[PDB]
Amino acid sequence: KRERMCMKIENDCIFEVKHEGKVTGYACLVGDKVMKPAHVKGVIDNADLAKLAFKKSSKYDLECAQIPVHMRSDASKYTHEKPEGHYNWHHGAVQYSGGRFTIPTGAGKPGDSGRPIFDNKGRVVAIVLGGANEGSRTALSVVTWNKDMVTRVTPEGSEEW
Amino acid sequence: KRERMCMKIENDCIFEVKHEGKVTGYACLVGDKVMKPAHVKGVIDNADLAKLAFKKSSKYDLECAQIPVHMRSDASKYTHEKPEGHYNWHHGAVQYSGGRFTIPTGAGKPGDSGRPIFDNKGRVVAIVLGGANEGSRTALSVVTWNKDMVTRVTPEGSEEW
């Protein structure tokens, strides 16, 4: 059941990043802000977004932009609560343990940066920046939200996708 | 059987050429090199092939380039022998007689250049460049391979496609 509304919100809140005719990442709609990883380069496949003025920060590895008014109804809902346990993702399941997001499978690859992670109610909880291969698992270097503050977690050995 | 494998080899080994938004020709990937008819102008429907520095030959009327490493497993097979009989083509079957390739119907149209001619085992024998309407048939001005050289057959009255 969860995958259905998950994929609905995904297609309603994901636009791929083009560069040199090839996909490189994804910029997603959260709340009232278009947000994209900064390590990835290119242009988003929309005339409305391409002309937007972007605020960029390498310390957090992220660009943001104000979404147009007419597109304000096509964005997700955010949250800051971080209960321990299990969460969904475009390629399956993720686990929040010890303040750390983990992929059990290790199925991550370049070009998967910017794909948001969702909660039980479909609310976006994080965005994947990169992965770190720890044994059979992949610790996820992501940008997440506190109540008022934006934080970044990057475990050792991570690599930008 | 032969028709289906010819179609799949053509799908995996042909890239269209577009100019002013209209298709103008075809480029084919054989062995470890991409080649296109030189007379046809446009851009290949692949940024990977579009950025390669193509080598030109007006006398042979052919452009060639060395394929990238990651496309090397998607390459058709070549040969150099020309037994007498019939051969496969995207538009049917071609007849070989006395050094002449001919279409049974004369159904070739402008913009059809570059579509490879396959052997019984799917190996490429020649590359179609142009046609000449002789009688009720069309003679093929094509590009074939010797032991180590390239030869071009252009019967009189032929026109570039």
C-alpha distance from A18 to closest chain B C-alpha (Å): 12
Asked how this structure was determined, the answer is cryo-EM
B68, B74, B79, B82: CA torsion to nearest 10: -120
Q: Which residue of chain B has the CA closest to A20?
A: B47
Other C-beta atoms lying within 10 Å of the C-beta of residue A148? 6
Cβ-based contacts of A43 with chain B (< 8 Å):
none
Provide the CB-side half-sphere exposure for A35 (13 A, CA).
25
C-alpha distance from B67 to closest chain A C-alpha (Å): 17
HEC sequence for A75-89: CCCECCCCCCEEEEE
Q: Which residue of chain A has the CA closest to B47?
A: A21
Residue B52 CB burial class (10 angstroms; 0-12, 13-18, ≥19): middle
DSSP symbol at B68: P
Indicate the SS3 state at residue B23. Answer: strand
**Is A20 close to B46, i.e. CB distance below 8 A?**
no
| Active-site annotation holder among A12, A58, A61, A141 | A61
Cβ-based contacts of A20 with chain B (< 8 Å):
47, 51
- Strands A14-19, A22-30: pairing kind: antiparallel
**CA angle, A14 then A64 then A151, to 5°:** 100
CA distance B57 to B63: 6
Cβ-based contacts of B46 with chain A (< 8 Å):
21
- What strands, in cross-sheet order, belong to the sheet with B22-30? B43-44, B14-19, B22-30, B33-37, B62-66, B55-57
The CA radius of gyration of chain B, in Å to the nearest whole number, is 15
C-alpha distance from B44 to closest chain A C-alpha (Å): 12
Q: Give the A-side interface with B, CB within 8 Å.
A: 20-22
CA distance B145 to A106: 48
CA distance B67 to B46: 12
Q: Give the B-side interface with A, CB within 8 Å.
A: 46-47, 50-51
User: Cα–chain-centroid distance for residue A53?
Assistant: 20
C-alpha distance from A23 to closest chain B C-alpha (Å): 12
Q: Which residues of B are catalytic?
A: 39, 61, 113
Q: Please count the residue pairs, one from chain A and one from chain B, whose beta carbons lie less than 8 angstroms apart.
A: 6
- Of chain A, the end-to-end C-alpha distance in Å amounts to 29
Phi, psi of A25 (to 5 degrees): -170, -165
Residue A8 CB burial class (10 angstroms; 0-12, 13-18, ≥19): exposed
Other C-beta atoms lying within 10 Å of the C-beta of residue B38? 20
Of the candidates B133, B135, B127, B134, the one whose C-alpha atom is nearest the C-alpha of residue B153 is B127
User: Cα–chain-centroid distance for residue B131?
Assistant: 12
Do residues A142 and A153 lie in contact, with contact meaning Cβ atoms separated by under 8 Å? yes
Of the candidates A153, A144, A143, A8, the one whose C-alpha atom is nearest the C-alpha of residue A75 is A8
| Active-site annotation holder among A113, A119, A141, A158 | A113
Q: Which residue of chain B has the CA closest to A19?
A: B47
CA distance B27 to B25: 7
| Active-site annotation holder among A12, A19, A39, A70 | A39
Q: Which residue of chain B has the CA closest to A21?
A: B47
State how far the alpha carbon of B114 is from the alpha carbons of A9, A124, B31, B44, in Å: 44, 50, 15, 12
PDB resolution in Å: 3.0
CA distance B140 to B128: 7
